[PDB]
Amino acid sequence: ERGWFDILDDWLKRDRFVFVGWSGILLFPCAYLALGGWLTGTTFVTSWYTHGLASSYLEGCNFLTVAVSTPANSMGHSLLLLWGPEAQGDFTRWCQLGGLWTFIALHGAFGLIGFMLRQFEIARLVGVRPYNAIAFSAPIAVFVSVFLIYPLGQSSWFFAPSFGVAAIFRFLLFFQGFHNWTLNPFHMMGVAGVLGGALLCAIHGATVENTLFQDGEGASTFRAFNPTQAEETYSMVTANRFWSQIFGIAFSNKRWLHFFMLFVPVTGLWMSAIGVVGLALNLRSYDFISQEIRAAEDPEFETFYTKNLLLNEGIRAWMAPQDQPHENFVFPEEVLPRGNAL
Amino acid sequence: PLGISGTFNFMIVFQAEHNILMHPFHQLGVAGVFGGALFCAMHGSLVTSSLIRETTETESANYGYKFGQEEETYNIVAAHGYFGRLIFQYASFNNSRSLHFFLAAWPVVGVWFAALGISTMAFNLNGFNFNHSVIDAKGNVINTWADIINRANLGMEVMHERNAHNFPLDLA
Amino acid sequence: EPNPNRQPVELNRTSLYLGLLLILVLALLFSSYFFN
Amino acid sequence: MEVNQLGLIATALFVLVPSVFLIILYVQTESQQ
């Protein structure tokens, strides 16, 4: 049977400069639209009607301050389809109402699905194990938990992260002040995985590069390697002795070493995603009840935990009126928490 | 401070007093450790994907490698054949030596920049200040995300060390 | 009537050390939140 | 400090139950030939 399906399969899987595949039918339009939406929005589109902010090169923002901002809080969790009941097919209103944000996030979500299907598809054709796709589940868990689950637990898309550099910085600081997110052990595990992954990256790279076999005569050692050679290019035995004597322990199994390098950052990102799922519901690690009981009753008891809550309280009161304009917070000067003199 | 919550206190007051998030050297540092973690999982998954079958399914594939063996344990040509097609051929490494040099260089250079961020903000050369940078035709301030960050920073500033300042400027 | 599917199980010494380290460190991390 | 007193047994079983699992598996590996 060589019907149209098999002929199409032939064409999709041609060995070209940019492999396409069946996954490419999903991947390429959704990736291209998410990227083109971000560039279109950061270049031309405002956030005046949703946030009270300028947010495009057209308005005078720079690369750090442009964003595609979230819709107004009054949109709730609306899909904000261009043909939906809010924009009613009006492209200009759609842009003013935040339609590009769901456009980017939804095409981005399906683009990410398409990329992971691409990793599976290519792996099956070439004949390798699909561990690169499996490792990519971690960026997907992060994207889905932060840009979709989190706002879905909150009041509206407005509280999702906006797609911009400084907008993301505001998201970091909002999470400190409102959620006390540094205190959260799921974030802590994520930090460990990211910093430990960066550590493993540096140390494995440096160790290989400094246990190389002399396989050529030049002072540039890069040339003395051939992709099809059968031998290891660096000494596992010397590397093992170095770290055993410097650090106490060392790797001795090269397969375990590289599985571990997959394991550490992937698990870290997955742990951080779980914590953000909790924050969708405000299920925070905000307090230690034992500390609060002591501190309420004993005005001489002070820790770095109590010092940090005072900072969170400053963040909330001083940023909320501007950051949540739909709430209409009017905080007179006299109610604002402030230390002496400042 | 030498403690977990003390570290967070340090980070928060740092942001209030230097706007480190808006400093390109902290941004290069973030690229260093985000990238380092990405390339870590990348290198780990590609080598693990191309391990040469030396074991049965009831045993750990790790027993397929023996400490000190002369021959490589995975097929870098197959790994490069997968990753070259994932992106395009010339975005993929086939020289294990320069690949590992890249894994060394990227996080190390990034963390150097992070270190130099803290060291130069020690002398108060702070992150970019775009507070009230966008102004309308009449002269009204048009807020950007930078001004929202500033609001958060002010809250951190006015509350930190709440009994320690007698004069209006926190100059150190 | 012996079942042919049985298989011995292994845990080597390095895996014991790694596992004990994970559990102890996880306990050191979560204990504060358990006492609250 | 007014800590939650279940915290003690929660931490103790958290360490003990999985640690004991690993020790059982390890020791019966050594005793094999």
Binding site: - | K66, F67, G68 | - | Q5
Partner: peptide
């Protein structure tokens, strides 16, 4: 109670370090 718990867990980890370094499986070349 909680102080004892924290210090006990910490002390076990330092003991674990000692065995993992000095009573490891020796790497053997082949």
């Amino acid at each position: 109670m909680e102080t004892i718990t924290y210090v006990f867990i910490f002390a076990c980890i330092i003991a674990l370090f000692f065995f993992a370094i000095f009573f490891r499986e020796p790497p053997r070349i082949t």
